[PDB]
Paper text:
All NPPs share a conserved zinc-binding catalytic domain (phosphodiesterase or PDE domain). NPPs hydrolyze pyrophosphate or phosphodiester bonds. In this extensive study, we determined the crystal structure of NPP3 from Rattus norvegicus in complex with a phosphate ion and various nucleotide ligands allowing us to characterize the substrate recognition of nucleotide triphosphates, dinucleotides and nucleotide sugars by NPP3. Similar to NPP1 and NPP2, the structure of NPP3 consists of two major domains, which interact via a large interface of 1279 Å2.
We determined a complex structure of NPP3T206A with the dinucleotide Ap4A using the same protocol as described for AMPNPP. One adenine base of the compound is bound in a similar manner as observed before for bound AMP. Major differences are observed in the ribose conformation, which is 2′-endo in the Ap4A-bound structure, whereas it is 3′-endo in the AMP- and AMPNPP-bound structures, and in the coordination of the α-phosphate group. This phosphate is coordinated with one oxygen to Zn2 and the oxygen which would be opposite of the T206 nucleophile is coordinated to Zn1. In contrast to the AMPNPP-bound structure the β-phosphate group is not coordinated to Zn1 but is hydrogen-bonded to N227, which is thus not bound to the α-phosphate group. In this orientation, the β-phosphate group is not positioned opposite to the attacking nucleophile for an in-line phosphoryl transfer. It follows that the observed binding mode is catalytically non-productive. Nevertheless, we speculate that the binding mode of the secondary (“leaving group”) nucleoside moiety resembles that in a productive binding mode. Gly480 and Gly481 are in close contact to the adenine base, whereas Gly484 is not in near distance to make any interaction with the bound ligand.
Author numbering: 140 to 146, 151 to 473, 477 to 581, 587 to 871
The structure:
Amino acid sequence: WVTEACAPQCPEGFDQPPVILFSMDGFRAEYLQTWSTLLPNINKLKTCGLHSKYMRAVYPTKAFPNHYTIVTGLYPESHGIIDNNMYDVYLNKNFSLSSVEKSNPAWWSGQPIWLTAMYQGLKAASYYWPGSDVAVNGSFPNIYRNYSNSVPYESRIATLLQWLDLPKAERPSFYTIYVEEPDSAGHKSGPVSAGVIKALQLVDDAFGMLMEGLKQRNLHNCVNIIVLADHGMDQTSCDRVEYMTDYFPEINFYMYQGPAPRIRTRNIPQDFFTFNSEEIVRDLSCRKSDQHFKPYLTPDLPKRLHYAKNVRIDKVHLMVDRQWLAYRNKNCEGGTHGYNNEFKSMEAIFLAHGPSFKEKTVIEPFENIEVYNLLCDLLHIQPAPNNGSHGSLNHLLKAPFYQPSHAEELSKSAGCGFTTPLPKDSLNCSCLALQEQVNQRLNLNRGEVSATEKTNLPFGRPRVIQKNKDHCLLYHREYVSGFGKAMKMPMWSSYTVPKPGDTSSLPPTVPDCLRADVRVDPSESQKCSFYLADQNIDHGFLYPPAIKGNNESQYDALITSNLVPMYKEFKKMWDYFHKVLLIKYAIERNGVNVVSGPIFDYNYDGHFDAPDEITNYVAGTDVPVPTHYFVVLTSCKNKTHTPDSCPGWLDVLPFVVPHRPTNVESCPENKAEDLWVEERFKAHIARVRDVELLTGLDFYQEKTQPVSEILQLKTYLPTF
Ligand SMILES: Nc1ncnc2c1ncn2[C@@H]1O[C@H](COP(=O)(O)OP(=O)(O)OP(=O)(O)OP(=O)(O)OC[C@H]2O[C@@H](n3cnc4c(N)ncnc43)[C@H](O)[C@@H]2O)[C@@H](O)[C@H]1O
Ligand SMILES: *[C@@H]1O[C@H](CO)[C@@H](O[C@@H]2O[C@H](CO)[C@@H](O)[C@H](O)[C@H]2NC(C)=O)[C@H](O)[C@H]1NC(C)=O
Ligand SMILES: *[C@@H]1O[C@H](CO)[C@@H](O[C@@H]2O[C@H](CO)[C@@H](O)[C@H](O)[C@H]2NC(C)=O)[C@H](O)[C@H]1NC(C)=O
Ligand SMILES: *[C@@H]1O[C@H](CO)[C@@H](O[C@@H]2O[C@H](CO)[C@@H](O)[C@H](O)[C@H]2NC(C)=O)[C@H](O)[C@H]1NC(C)=O
Ligand SMILES: *[C@@H]1O[C@H](CO)[C@@H](O)[C@H](O)[C@H]1NC(C)=O
Ligand SMILES: *[C@@H]1O[C@H](CO)[C@@H](O)[C@H](O)[C@H]1NC(C)=O
Ligand SMILES: [Ca+2]
Ligand SMILES: [Zn+2]
Ligand SMILES: [Zn+2]
């Protein structure tokens, strides 16, 4: 097989192609990029089959949360396996590999692919995989193996080939195989060592034995095989360890040490909830100038991680920097994983071979949450509810099983039509600069509406995937917004900033000028007096008035309908972004389409809040306070075209920045805004899908491109 050239070549009795999910623990993406030519079997798989540049793992980049994510399509917060070592307050039990609690089904939520196949007629076998030797939902796979780490790779392969030799009625359709290397070698001497080369060659021989075994049964061009990894590997040092003794006089708390630390009380279950979590994060925030960790309360963590909605996830969390560790007191010489999933070293491998997959294809990076839906498509079965966007992985398949469709709008735009240029209620807003006939600019004719629809909405208006959401669209010459009547603020604001000429002299925002929007009813509008009573929250502009047109154009944005509740400290970041950063991004991208708006996620479940879920409002008013603010930047991949006139692929840069009363996360004491604002926005980069879930809005529905291709853009995570 290894010396043979590149190839629906299924033998007698094989109607549907069998699926084999192969896991090579700790096989980082860099290992394939650098050492593929030293591994002849994996190199042939890389040459002949399909492979991604890398596969993104889930946070924390550990074995058990990641392996169970691959088979469920769920984030650790949903499937329950948040770590290998965890504690549940309600169960009052400790989960560990050395305990009998590993086999307890109470810890394992969701529906793994073996159960999904079993519940839909198909049979499933497993030769090691976390959860496979556990009775998840009261059921084990048809054939399984109780974990034993030292069983030779040849024996694991031989048993799998023996399972494929079984008669059609007994023979499983889905298979899982797991190997401990090159992870074990990665821990011992780091990712750049002779030990990892020996381990990479060992796993190549294992894969080679499987391919040669399949060739002997004439299944080498029949079986749909996926070769992947749970996470990557990075080098550690004992000179690169942060100690909690340097921040606390005495440690009275329990700490899950390493690259992804969690802090809780020692007195469990009695003090689990009463434990001052907010005190520990405050006691660790901005303590040292060159601090190699950042403390966080789980809802404050970047939204793209989706690591908060689970009782097993302790409120105190530490984000450790690259190649660093965080320990309780004074191993570390070698290598480890568990760090941020965006880190290059934490990136895993993904290779695919078989009749259903495209030949000699290099695909762009994707996330492990998407693998579950693909496994269902290969097995011709219906997936259980998961976090993967069904259809985003169709570009990997020759003939896609599932055809995705646009999300249907549950609420249509109504009202807010122009009637009279004079407002019925001033709403305690004042603009002494006027005299008021600038209100006629808001009265756009059919041609004027069509003109702003083409420029500011090139991919169409974001659809409202919310039932009974009373809203209206507001048209202006420089921007278009979707105003939410119940919350008295816009859900979204779309505008295409053209390529700027000179950075030297840019016009500022017109001060002390604010008026009522004549189109919006006073009862559904915000008042300027609402912000006088509140001392921590001030009014902010969603669309920046001075970004487009002249001084006359600014008046179209100096209205109550463009107002959003903002913390004085957050307003500093927001204003710096729209004044400096956004213009810089517009130069590089040859114009940029901006879609901004508020996010409400008080229960931190990653979904848009229901009115009853909002716990904070503007002092003595029903105007809700947003938890986060989204900024989705869309430009053309080909920089020769502007976002409003682009026929090809799009380039996206979404942000989900937390709306916090302090900027303690940035540690900005005596630091100018050019040193921390960009760093803070970049730290909160998310996918378009993340924004969609948090808002209940669906983007790019009017973009002339297949749904499967738009889903690739919606699941894309920009990396710098
Ligand atoms: N279904 C299943 N049921 C049960 N078990 C299953 C299983 N599937 C897989 N496993 C087991 O899972 C492991 C593979 O997972 P891993 O990829 O190693 O990661 P993990 O399980 O998420 O964390 P773990 O607790 O094991 O790592 P730790 O840092 O504490 O450290 C591990 C080792 O690395 C060393 N190490 C860690 N960090 C180091 C560093 N910075 N420098 C040097 N050595 C380091 C430690 O000394 C130690 O020897 C294997 O042990 C395997 O047998
Ligand atoms: C990830 O997918 C899961 C499953 O579809 C979502 O979790 C469900 O959420 C609903 C509503 O909150 C609950 O009633 C279910 O009990 C949850 N199921 C499980 C298995 O947890 C989850 O919200 C999705 N996450 C994101 C961020 O979209
Ligand atoms: C994995 O190990 C468990 C525990 O040793 C085995 O489960 C036992 O199986 C027998 C026969 O079905 C039952 O009578 C016992 O009650 C089970 N004990 C427990 C604690 O579950 C299981 O069969 C082993 N599986 C394999 C494939 O070896
Ligand atoms: C889970 O493991 C932790 C840590 O080993 C145990 O925590 C101890 O709990 C008692 C109170 O029950 C405290 O007085 C100790 O100080 C804790 N030890 C540490 C090291 O923090 C906990 O008891 C275990 N729970 C179960 C059910 O096994
Ligand atoms: C658990 O199994 C039952 C059938 O016994 C099924 O109805 C249910 O949907 C399963 N739940 C999960 C999460 O797999
Ligand atoms: C950009 O589009 C033009 C046609 O308008 C084409 O000639 C050019 O090759 C494209 N650039 C890239 C990088 O594909
Ligand atoms: Ca929510
Ligand atoms: Zn691992
Ligand atoms: Zn490991």
